[PDB]
Amino acid sequence: LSDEDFKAVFGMTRSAFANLPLWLQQHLLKEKGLF
């Protein structure tokens, strides 16, 4: 995903996502149907 596409899917930057606890990162990936 591009940075802009990442922000559109997750509503946050890549760097913001990396600051989330792993459990929430994984929650969001499943929720959005990605990686």
mmCIF file of all heavy atoms in Angstrom, unseen atoms left out:
data_model
loop_
_atom_site.group_PDB
_atom_site.id
_atom_site.type_symbol
_atom_site.label_atom_id
_atom_site.label_comp_id
_atom_site.label_asym_id
_atom_site.label_seq_id
_atom_site.Cartn_x
_atom_site.Cartn_y
_atom_site.Cartn_z
ATOM 1 N N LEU A 1 0.786 -1.203 0.000
ATOM 2 C CA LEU A 1 0.000 0.000 0.000
ATOM 3 C C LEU A 1 0.825 1.262 0.000
ATOM 4 O O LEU A 1 1.830 1.244 0.699
ATOM 5 C CB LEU A 1 -0.862 0.099 1.265
ATOM 6 C CG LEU A 1 -2.014 -0.893 1.404
ATOM 7 C CD1 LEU A 1 -2.670 -0.568 2.726
ATOM 8 C CD2 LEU A 1 -2.926 -0.808 0.202
ATOM 9 N N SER A 2 0.415 2.274 -0.733
ATOM 10 C CA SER A 2 1.090 3.557 -0.643
ATOM 11 C C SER A 2 0.815 4.202 0.703
ATOM 12 O O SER A 2 -0.106 3.766 1.435
ATOM 13 C CB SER A 2 0.635 4.467 -1.779
ATOM 14 O OG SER A 2 -0.720 4.812 -1.529
ATOM 15 N N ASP A 3 1.568 5.222 1.066
ATOM 16 C CA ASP A 3 1.241 5.916 2.312
ATOM 17 C C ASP A 3 -0.162 6.461 2.303
ATOM 18 O O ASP A 3 -0.868 6.392 3.302
ATOM 19 C CB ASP A 3 2.211 7.075 2.558
ATOM 20 C CG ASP A 3 3.628 6.614 2.891
ATOM 21 O OD1 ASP A 3 3.872 5.411 3.055
ATOM 22 O OD2 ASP A 3 4.508 7.494 2.988
ATOM 23 N N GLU A 4 -0.629 7.027 1.188
ATOM 24 C CA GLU A 4 -1.954 7.595 1.139
ATOM 25 C C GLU A 4 -3.015 6.507 1.241
ATOM 26 O O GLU A 4 -4.023 6.661 1.900
ATOM 27 C CB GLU A 4 -2.104 8.395 -0.159
ATOM 28 C CG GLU A 4 -1.436 9.763 0.011
ATOM 29 C CD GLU A 4 -2.119 10.579 1.111
ATOM 30 O OE1 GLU A 4 -3.370 10.634 1.116
ATOM 31 O OE2 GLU A 4 -1.411 11.164 1.973
ATOM 32 N N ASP A 5 -2.814 5.374 0.586
ATOM 33 C CA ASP A 5 -3.735 4.246 0.638
ATOM 34 C C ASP A 5 -3.777 3.642 2.030
ATOM 35 O O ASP A 5 -4.796 3.218 2.547
ATOM 36 C CB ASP A 5 -3.341 3.160 -0.361
ATOM 37 C CG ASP A 5 -3.561 3.437 -1.818
ATOM 38 O OD1 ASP A 5 -4.315 4.392 -2.118
ATOM 39 O OD2 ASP A 5 -2.979 2.696 -2.627
ATOM 40 N N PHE A 6 -2.621 3.581 2.706
ATOM 41 C CA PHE A 6 -2.534 3.057 4.056
ATOM 42 C C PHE A 6 -3.387 3.935 4.970
ATOM 43 O O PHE A 6 -4.164 3.447 5.787
ATOM 44 C CB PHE A 6 -1.065 2.980 4.495
ATOM 45 C CG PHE A 6 -0.910 2.307 5.855
ATOM 46 C CD1 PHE A 6 -0.491 0.988 5.889
ATOM 47 C CD2 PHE A 6 -1.153 2.887 7.061
ATOM 48 C CE1 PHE A 6 -0.341 0.331 7.099
ATOM 49 C CE2 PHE A 6 -1.016 2.270 8.257
ATOM 50 C CZ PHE A 6 -0.599 0.956 8.298
ATOM 51 N N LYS A 7 -3.237 5.272 4.840
ATOM 52 C CA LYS A 7 -4.007 6.208 5.648
ATOM 53 C C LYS A 7 -5.471 6.062 5.353
ATOM 54 O O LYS A 7 -6.276 6.164 6.266
ATOM 55 C CB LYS A 7 -3.510 7.633 5.363
ATOM 56 C CG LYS A 7 -2.198 7.961 6.003
ATOM 57 C CD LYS A 7 -1.524 9.212 5.515
ATOM 58 C CE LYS A 7 -2.386 10.429 5.642
ATOM 59 N NZ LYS A 7 -1.598 11.631 5.112
ATOM 60 N N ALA A 8 -5.872 5.824 4.123
ATOM 61 C CA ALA A 8 -7.289 5.695 3.804
ATOM 62 C C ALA A 8 -7.860 4.420 4.424
ATOM 63 O O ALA A 8 -8.984 4.386 4.941
ATOM 64 C CB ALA A 8 -7.560 5.668 2.315
ATOM 65 N N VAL A 9 -7.118 3.321 4.396
ATOM 66 C CA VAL A 9 -7.613 2.033 4.918
ATOM 67 C C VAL A 9 -7.685 2.065 6.427
ATOM 68 O O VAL A 9 -8.710 1.711 7.007
ATOM 69 C CB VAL A 9 -6.736 0.841 4.476
ATOM 70 C CG1 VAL A 9 -7.185 -0.410 5.241
ATOM 71 C CG2 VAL A 9 -6.764 0.589 2.969
ATOM 72 N N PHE A 10 -6.598 2.483 7.081
ATOM 73 C CA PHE A 10 -6.504 2.386 8.547
ATOM 74 C C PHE A 10 -6.811 3.671 9.265
ATOM 75 O O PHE A 10 -6.958 3.644 10.503
ATOM 76 C CB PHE A 10 -5.081 1.924 8.950
ATOM 77 C CG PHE A 10 -4.847 0.498 8.499
ATOM 78 C CD1 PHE A 10 -4.032 0.241 7.392
ATOM 79 C CD2 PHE A 10 -5.415 -0.581 9.139
ATOM 80 C CE1 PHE A 10 -3.797 -1.060 6.950
ATOM 81 C CE2 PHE A 10 -5.200 -1.876 8.718
ATOM 82 C CZ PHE A 10 -4.392 -2.116 7.634
ATOM 83 N N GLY A 11 -6.914 4.796 8.571
ATOM 84 C CA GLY A 11 -7.225 6.052 9.206
ATOM 85 C C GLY A 11 -6.134 6.627 10.042
ATOM 86 O O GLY A 11 -6.371 7.434 10.954
ATOM 87 N N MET A 12 -4.899 6.227 9.768
ATOM 88 C CA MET A 12 -3.720 6.649 10.502
ATOM 89 C C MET A 12 -2.498 6.438 9.636
ATOM 90 O O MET A 12 -2.571 5.655 8.677
ATOM 91 C CB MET A 12 -3.593 5.874 11.808
ATOM 92 C CG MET A 12 -3.296 4.419 11.583
ATOM 93 S SD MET A 12 -3.372 3.393 13.055
ATOM 94 C CE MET A 12 -5.112 3.422 13.352
ATOM 95 N N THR A 13 -1.403 7.102 9.948
ATOM 96 C CA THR A 13 -0.165 6.811 9.210
ATOM 97 C C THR A 13 0.450 5.476 9.595
ATOM 98 O O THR A 13 0.130 4.887 10.629
ATOM 99 C CB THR A 13 0.902 7.910 9.430
ATOM 100 O OG1 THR A 13 1.298 7.771 10.812
ATOM 101 C CG2 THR A 13 0.348 9.308 9.122
ATOM 102 N N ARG A 14 1.353 4.972 8.764
ATOM 103 C CA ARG A 14 2.125 3.760 9.003
ATOM 104 C C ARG A 14 2.858 3.856 10.334
ATOM 105 O O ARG A 14 2.943 2.920 11.153
ATOM 106 C CB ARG A 14 3.176 3.457 7.916
ATOM 107 C CG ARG A 14 2.709 3.556 6.488
ATOM 108 C CD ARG A 14 3.878 3.394 5.504
ATOM 109 N NE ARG A 14 3.488 2.655 4.307
ATOM 110 C CZ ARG A 14 3.206 1.365 4.255
ATOM 111 N NH1 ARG A 14 3.250 0.588 5.322
ATOM 112 N NH2 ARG A 14 2.866 0.823 3.097
ATOM 113 N N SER A 15 3.432 5.027 10.594
ATOM 114 C CA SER A 15 4.169 5.220 11.841
ATOM 115 C C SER A 15 3.235 5.219 13.059
ATOM 116 O O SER A 15 3.615 4.667 14.104
ATOM 117 C CB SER A 15 5.001 6.512 11.741
ATOM 118 O OG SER A 15 4.196 7.624 11.469
ATOM 119 N N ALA A 16 2.047 5.821 12.917
ATOM 120 C CA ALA A 16 1.058 5.745 14.011
ATOM 121 C C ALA A 16 0.651 4.315 14.320
ATOM 122 O O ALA A 16 0.543 3.832 15.451
ATOM 123 C CB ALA A 16 -0.192 6.575 13.695
ATOM 124 N N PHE A 17 0.397 3.550 13.251
ATOM 125 C CA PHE A 17 0.048 2.138 13.388
ATOM 126 C C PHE A 17 1.134 1.389 14.120
ATOM 127 O O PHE A 17 0.839 0.540 14.965
ATOM 128 C CB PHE A 17 -0.193 1.589 12.000
ATOM 129 C CG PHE A 17 -0.588 0.136 11.881
ATOM 130 C CD1 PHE A 17 -1.940 -0.204 11.824
ATOM 131 C CD2 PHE A 17 0.369 -0.860 11.824
ATOM 132 C CE1 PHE A 17 -2.321 -1.537 11.713
ATOM 133 C CE2 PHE A 17 -0.018 -2.178 11.711
ATOM 134 C CZ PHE A 17 -1.347 -2.495 11.650
ATOM 135 N N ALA A 18 2.420 1.662 13.833
ATOM 136 C CA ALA A 18 3.508 0.957 14.477
ATOM 137 C C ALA A 18 3.641 1.286 15.950
ATOM 138 O O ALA A 18 4.277 0.542 16.690
ATOM 139 C CB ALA A 18 4.827 1.290 13.763
ATOM 140 N N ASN A 19 3.046 2.385 16.404
ATOM 141 C CA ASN A 19 3.025 2.754 17.807
ATOM 142 C C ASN A 19 1.912 2.028 18.569
ATOM 143 O O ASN A 19 1.943 2.002 19.803
ATOM 144 C CB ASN A 19 2.840 4.249 17.905
ATOM 145 C CG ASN A 19 2.812 4.709 19.307
ATOM 146 O OD1 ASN A 19 3.773 4.673 20.105
ATOM 147 N ND2 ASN A 19 1.729 5.181 19.736
ATOM 148 N N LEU A 20 0.949 1.459 17.881
ATOM 149 C CA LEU A 20 -0.102 0.706 18.549
ATOM 150 C C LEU A 20 0.446 -0.591 19.143
ATOM 151 O O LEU A 20 1.403 -1.154 18.621
ATOM 152 C CB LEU A 20 -1.207 0.344 17.595
ATOM 153 C CG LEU A 20 -2.030 1.497 17.055
ATOM 154 C CD1 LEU A 20 -2.979 1.039 15.969
ATOM 155 C CD2 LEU A 20 -2.775 2.163 18.225
ATOM 156 N N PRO A 21 -0.148 -1.081 20.198
ATOM 157 C CA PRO A 21 0.218 -2.425 20.692
ATOM 158 C C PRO A 21 -0.041 -3.439 19.574
ATOM 159 O O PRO A 21 -0.932 -3.317 18.738
ATOM 160 C CB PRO A 21 -0.682 -2.656 21.883
ATOM 161 C CG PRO A 21 -1.626 -1.558 21.912
ATOM 162 C CD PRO A 21 -1.195 -0.477 21.020
ATOM 163 N N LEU A 22 0.787 -4.488 19.571
ATOM 164 C CA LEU A 22 0.702 -5.534 18.585
ATOM 165 C C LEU A 22 -0.732 -6.090 18.513
ATOM 166 O O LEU A 22 -1.249 -6.341 17.424
ATOM 167 C CB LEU A 22 1.654 -6.647 18.922
ATOM 168 C CG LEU A 22 1.570 -7.825 17.972
ATOM 169 C CD1 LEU A 22 1.860 -7.427 16.542
ATOM 170 C CD2 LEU A 22 2.547 -8.926 18.421
ATOM 171 N N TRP A 23 -1.405 -6.291 19.668
ATOM 172 C CA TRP A 23 -2.738 -6.872 19.612
ATOM 173 C C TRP A 23 -3.683 -5.999 18.787
ATOM 174 O O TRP A 23 -4.556 -6.515 18.094
ATOM 175 C CB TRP A 23 -3.337 -7.057 20.998
ATOM 176 C CG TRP A 23 -3.692 -5.860 21.830
ATOM 177 C CD1 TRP A 23 -2.889 -5.292 22.742
ATOM 178 C CD2 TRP A 23 -4.963 -5.073 21.825
ATOM 179 N NE1 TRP A 23 -3.548 -4.238 23.291
ATOM 180 C CE2 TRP A 23 -4.782 -4.055 22.791
ATOM 181 C CE3 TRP A 23 -6.114 -5.193 21.111
ATOM 182 C CZ2 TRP A 23 -5.830 -3.123 23.028
ATOM 183 C CZ3 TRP A 23 -7.137 -4.275 21.350
ATOM 184 C CH2 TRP A 23 -6.983 -3.260 22.300
ATOM 185 N N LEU A 24 -3.508 -4.691 18.855
ATOM 186 C CA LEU A 24 -4.410 -3.798 18.098
ATOM 187 C C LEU A 24 -3.987 -3.753 16.620
ATOM 188 O O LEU A 24 -4.851 -3.686 15.722
ATOM 189 C CB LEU A 24 -4.440 -2.425 18.714
ATOM 190 C CG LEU A 24 -5.431 -1.493 18.060
ATOM 191 N N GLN A 25 -2.695 -3.782 16.332
ATOM 192 C CA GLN A 25 -2.245 -3.898 14.944
ATOM 193 C C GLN A 25 -2.888 -5.083 14.261
ATOM 194 O O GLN A 25 -3.417 -5.016 13.145
ATOM 195 C CB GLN A 25 -0.711 -4.028 14.851
ATOM 196 C CG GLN A 25 0.057 -2.809 15.337
ATOM 197 C CD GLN A 25 1.529 -3.002 15.283
ATOM 198 O OE1 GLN A 25 2.052 -3.732 14.461
ATOM 199 N NE2 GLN A 25 2.265 -2.349 16.170
ATOM 200 N N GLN A 26 -2.832 -6.235 14.971
ATOM 201 C CA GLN A 26 -3.380 -7.479 14.421
ATOM 202 C C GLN A 26 -4.910 -7.412 14.305
ATOM 203 O O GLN A 26 -5.482 -7.909 13.332
ATOM 204 C CB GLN A 26 -2.966 -8.700 15.262
ATOM 205 C CG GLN A 26 -1.471 -8.978 15.337
ATOM 206 C CD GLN A 26 -0.875 -9.402 14.020
ATOM 207 O OE1 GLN A 26 0.152 -8.936 13.465
ATOM 208 N NE2 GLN A 26 -1.606 -10.372 13.493
ATOM 209 N N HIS A 27 -5.555 -6.809 15.283
ATOM 210 C CA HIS A 27 -7.000 -6.597 15.254
ATOM 211 C C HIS A 27 -7.371 -5.838 13.997
ATOM 212 O O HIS A 27 -8.288 -6.205 13.235
ATOM 213 C CB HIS A 27 -7.392 -5.874 16.530
ATOM 214 C CG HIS A 27 -8.765 -5.301 16.582
ATOM 215 N ND1 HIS A 27 -9.248 -4.191 15.956
ATOM 216 C CD2 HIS A 27 -9.788 -5.797 17.280
ATOM 217 C CE1 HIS A 27 -10.527 -4.000 16.249
ATOM 218 N NE2 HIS A 27 -10.853 -4.966 17.047
ATOM 219 N N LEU A 28 -6.679 -4.739 13.722
ATOM 220 C CA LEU A 28 -6.969 -3.908 12.562
ATOM 221 C C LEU A 28 -6.696 -4.614 11.230
ATOM 222 O O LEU A 28 -7.483 -4.478 10.280
ATOM 223 C CB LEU A 28 -6.148 -2.605 12.593
ATOM 224 C CG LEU A 28 -6.583 -1.603 13.675
ATOM 225 C CD1 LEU A 28 -5.557 -0.512 13.812
ATOM 226 C CD2 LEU A 28 -7.936 -1.004 13.355
ATOM 227 N N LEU A 29 -5.614 -5.364 11.130
ATOM 228 C CA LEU A 29 -5.358 -6.098 9.897
ATOM 229 C C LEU A 29 -6.500 -7.066 9.592
ATOM 230 O O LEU A 29 -6.997 -7.144 8.471
ATOM 231 C CB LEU A 29 -4.024 -6.849 9.977
ATOM 232 C CG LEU A 29 -2.778 -5.965 9.975
ATOM 233 N N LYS A 30 -6.927 -7.809 10.618
ATOM 234 C CA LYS A 30 -8.042 -8.744 10.353
ATOM 235 C C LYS A 30 -9.303 -7.988 9.990
ATOM 236 O O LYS A 30 -10.013 -8.415 9.065
ATOM 237 C CB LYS A 30 -8.241 -9.639 11.569
ATOM 238 C CG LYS A 30 -7.140 -10.593 11.904
ATOM 239 C CD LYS A 30 -7.457 -11.454 13.128
ATOM 240 C CE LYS A 30 -6.304 -12.313 13.597
ATOM 241 N NZ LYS A 30 -5.244 -11.449 14.152
ATOM 242 N N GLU A 31 -9.567 -6.915 10.693
ATOM 243 C CA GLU A 31 -10.794 -6.170 10.521
ATOM 244 C C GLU A 31 -10.911 -5.631 9.104
ATOM 245 O O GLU A 31 -11.992 -5.619 8.505
ATOM 246 C CB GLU A 31 -10.856 -5.003 11.496
ATOM 247 C CG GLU A 31 -11.972 -4.036 11.159
ATOM 248 C CD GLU A 31 -13.307 -4.516 11.645
ATOM 249 O OE1 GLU A 31 -13.560 -5.752 11.706
ATOM 250 O OE2 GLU A 31 -14.193 -3.725 12.003
ATOM 251 N N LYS A 32 -9.803 -5.179 8.550
ATOM 252 C CA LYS A 32 -9.793 -4.559 7.216
ATOM 253 C C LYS A 32 -9.568 -5.597 6.125
ATOM 254 O O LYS A 32 -9.624 -5.295 4.920
ATOM 255 C CB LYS A 32 -8.729 -3.449 7.129
ATOM 256 C CG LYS A 32 -8.881 -2.339 8.150
ATOM 257 C CD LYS A 32 -10.207 -1.609 8.104
ATOM 258 C CE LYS A 32 -10.188 -0.473 9.102
ATOM 259 N NZ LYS A 32 -11.475 0.178 9.313
ATOM 260 N N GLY A 33 -9.302 -6.853 6.474
ATOM 261 C CA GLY A 33 -9.081 -7.911 5.512
ATOM 262 C C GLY A 33 -7.738 -7.879 4.805
ATOM 263 O O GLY A 33 -7.647 -8.318 3.669
ATOM 264 N N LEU A 34 -6.720 -7.361 5.492
ATOM 265 C CA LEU A 34 -5.396 -7.278 4.943
ATOM 266 C C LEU A 34 -4.381 -8.079 5.788
ATOM 267 O O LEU A 34 -4.715 -8.676 6.792
ATOM 268 C CB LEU A 34 -4.993 -5.810 4.844
ATOM 269 C CG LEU A 34 -5.888 -4.922 3.994
ATOM 270 C CD1 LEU A 34 -5.372 -3.506 3.987
ATOM 271 C CD2 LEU A 34 -5.952 -5.431 2.576
ATOM 272 N N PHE A 35 -3.174 -8.039 5.330
ATOM 273 C CA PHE A 35 -1.904 -8.717 5.347
ATOM 274 C C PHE A 35 -2.108 -10.014 6.122
ATOM 275 O O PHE A 35 -2.997 -10.704 5.513
ATOM 276 C CB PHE A 35 -0.897 -7.648 5.861
ATOM 277 C CG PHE A 35 -0.018 -7.278 4.655
ATOM 278 C CD1 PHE A 35 0.929 -6.270 4.660
ATOM 279 C CD2 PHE A 35 -0.187 -8.003 3.482
ATOM 280 C CE1 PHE A 35 1.705 -5.957 3.561
ATOM 281 C CE2 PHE A 35 0.575 -7.713 2.369
ATOM 282 C CZ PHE A 35 1.518 -6.696 2.403
#
